[PDB]
């Protein structure tokens, strides 16, 4: 049955073994579904990233097909580019763009972002989401760990292993999927849900960028989920430090009723995003610069 799943994934990935062209694998990261390495392309010396996911270590194996559907169908300027996929022994390897700036997590846990920088992140993220949600794709795991940066401060959404599609025949999803602290209240309540859940998770990421941590982060997962399910929307620890503009923005995201929550398309017009700086404005936040 492992062997049965290996055969199925083989029909879907590219033929071959990229070790035939990559050198010097160095692990740089751990994800929910596997690990991430830098590799050197031997013909040219360029760097790529390689995501390795052990078919035996998955919560749900069939979610590994997510990486193939996104790669094949849903590329965009603010989405990490995937080049090729391979089955190597017991692992799916995806060779992808290397985002040398690392994850937004390393930033929010170590410095303070100003509002120009927060607005730049939110705009980049909302551009990816407007396009994905127009095609019925819901990411379902928006949080700082899923946002990667280039060396020159461009922002890209990554980590689509848990995404799902909605459509006229399947207008909503029912799976309990996400990282507890960032999960939308309707998703925790087990109400069927749609793209609106990424909007709520993005609002929690805005709290990450202001406070450094999502709400209830010191509470065990389950307890945090109960409180998200049952309490009023969570508040910034530092409400006093955010502009009225940023506050009114967040109030469009952390709306408990999914019907009243802003859509990505609507949030691209919010006046808070007018503060968005260029990618250069993100650069000084990165570990090699701060």
């Amino acid at each position: 049955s492992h062997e049965q799943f290996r055969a199925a994934l083989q029909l879907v990935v590219d033929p071959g073994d990229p070790r035939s062209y990559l050198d010097n694998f160095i692990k740089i990261g751990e994800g929910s579904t596997g690990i991430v390495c830098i590799a050197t392309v031997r013909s040219s010396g360029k760097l790529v990233a390689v995501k390795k996911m052990d078919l035996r270590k998955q919560q749900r194996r069939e979610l590994l097909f997510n990486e193939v559907v996104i790669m094949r169908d849903y590329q965009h300027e603010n989405v990490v580019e995937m080049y090729n996929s391979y089955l190597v022994g017991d692992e799916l390897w995806v060779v992808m763009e290397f985002l040398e700036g690392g994850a937004l997590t390393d930033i929010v846990t170590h410095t303070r972002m100003n509002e120009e920088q927060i607005a730049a992140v939110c705009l980049a993220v909302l551009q990816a989401l407007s396009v994905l949600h127009a095609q019925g794709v819901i990411h379902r795991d928006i949080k700082s760990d899923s946002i990667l940066l280039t060396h020159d401060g461009r922002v890209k959404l990554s980590d689509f292993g848990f995404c799902a599609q909605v459509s006229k025949e399947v207008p909503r999803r029912k799976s309990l999927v996400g990282t507890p602290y960032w999960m939308a209240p309707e998703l925790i309540s087990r109400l069927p849900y749609g793209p609106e859940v990424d909007i709520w998770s993005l609002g929690i990421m805005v709290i990450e960028m202001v406070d450094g941590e999502p709400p209830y982060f010191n509470e065990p997962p389950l307890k945090a989920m109960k409180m998200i399910r049952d309490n009023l929307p969570p508040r910034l620890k530092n409400l006093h430090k955010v502009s009225p503009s940023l506050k009114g923005f967040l109030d469009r995201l952390l709306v408990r009723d999914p019907a009243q929550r802003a859509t990505a398309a609507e949030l691209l017009k919010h006046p808070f995003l007018a503060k968005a700086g260029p990618p250069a404005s993100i650069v000084p936040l990165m570990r090699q610069n701060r």
Binding site: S32, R173, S175, T179
Partner: peptide
């Protein structure tokens, strides 16, 4: 904890 969960369906 920052780990993603999957349990529904």
């Amino acid at each position: 904890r920052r780990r993603t969960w999957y349990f529904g369906g």
